[PDB]
Structure formats: C-alpha cells, structure tokens
Amino acid sequence: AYTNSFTRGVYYPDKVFRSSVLH
Amino acid sequence: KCVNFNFNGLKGTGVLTESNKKFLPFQQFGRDIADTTDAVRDPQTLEI
C-alpha cells in the first residue's frame, strides 16, 4: 500500500503577493 | 500625495495609489523584487 507523490504537496507558504519573481 | 501611513503598526512614508494587482484573499501584503513593500491592504476597510 504505497505510491509516490510526483510533485504534489506544495502550497503558498506566507501570504505576501509576488508577481513573476522566483522566490 | 507623499504621506506617512501607519497600518496597525506598519509604519512608512510614501505615495499611496489605487492598486491594480490582484491579491488573493489570503494575502495582506505585497512584495516586489528584493523584498520592497510595493502594496498594502488596510486592516480596517480592507483596501488594496
């Protein structure tokens, strides 16, 4: 009973808008 | 017009203008590149 999460799971970490800027 | 603003302790000086960037409802600040505070919401009337 195992399967891999390919790239899921990431989220907006801190609620401070950033446009078109790699954080 | 250049004006001191004190948003619940967020103190600064600048020209506040009608914002045109779309903050998602969980966002209460705005940062440009190099962490410059580019936009802010009012903690009282919720204006960007």
From Swiss-Prot, chain A:
Attaches the virion to the cell membrane by interacting with host receptor, initiating the infection. The major receptor is host ACE2. When S2/S2' has been cleaved, binding to the receptor triggers direct fusion at the cell membrane. When S2/S2' has not been cleaved, binding to the receptor results in internalization of the virus by endocytosis using host TFRC and GRM2 and leading to fusion of the virion membrane with the host endosomal membrane. Alternatively, may use NRP1/NRP2 and integrin as entry receptors. Binds to host ACE2. RBD also interacts with the N-linked glycan on 'Asn-90' of ACE2. Cleavage of S generates a polybasic C-terminal sequence on S1 that binds to host Neuropilin-1 (NRP1) and Neuropilin-2 (NRP2) receptors. Interacts with host integrin alpha-5/beta-1 (ITGA5:ITGB1) and with ACE2 in complex with integrin alpha-5/beta-1 (ITGA5:ITGB1). May interact via cytoplasmic c-terminus with M protein. May interact (via N-terminus) with host bilirubin and biliverdin, thereby preventing antibody binding to the SARS-CoV-2 spike NTD via an allosteric mechanism. The lineage of its organism: Viruses, Riboviria, Orthornavirae, Pisuviricota, Pisoniviricetes. The gene is S. The chain holds residues 27 to 49 of 1273 of the full protein. This is Spike protein S1.
